């Protein structure tokens, strides 16, 4: 399979609360074989302005990502960052 | 050394002259060691709009990616894509 890339985009609004998302957002990330790339790394803005917190997250299969973003837990932790900050999110496939 | 990951999110007017931004962008690419993960791969949308072509390529080092951008050679290519296209690109700085 080709890989799929879950990518992130993400401004917080409220940082207490968005640690509540990505720790009950970790044994989803867990379950599906996420590997983390980068995750609020420093960003070179180059054209366009960027969130300040970007993730970029590869995964064994688009299947594998879309199947994570539909798992009970994940959608519960979703739910929490919905409303503590602003993203957006997709998967790309990865080059075959 | 983290990695640099250079994302590009692109909606293209016209194919045509945006097959001559990838291939005279080519040469810089493969000077700087880029290792393109994905290359306009099929996208689904989890939350908010994403533009059609997203790009994820990932270089030995943020400084890799960021000479790359800056070169010549691909300022030249860039000038190509920036008539024919939307476009918003970063690098985002692997982890570490």
């Known amino acids: 399979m ?49 969130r300040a917190r970007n993730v970029v997250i590869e995964f064994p299969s688009v299947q594998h990502a879309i199947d994570c973003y539909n798992s009970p837990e994940y959608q519960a932790a979703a739910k929490i960052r919905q409303e503590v900050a602003d993203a957006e999110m997709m998967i790309v496939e990865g080059i075959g």
Do not use: H
Request: no cysteine.
């Open 2 to 50: 080709a890989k799929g890339y879950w990518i992130a985009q993400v401004d917080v609004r409220d940082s207490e609360r968005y640690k509540d998302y990505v720790s009950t957002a970790k044994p989803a990330f867990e379950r599906f074989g996420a590997n983390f790339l980068a995750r609020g790394g420093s960003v070179t803005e180059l054209e366009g302005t960027a």
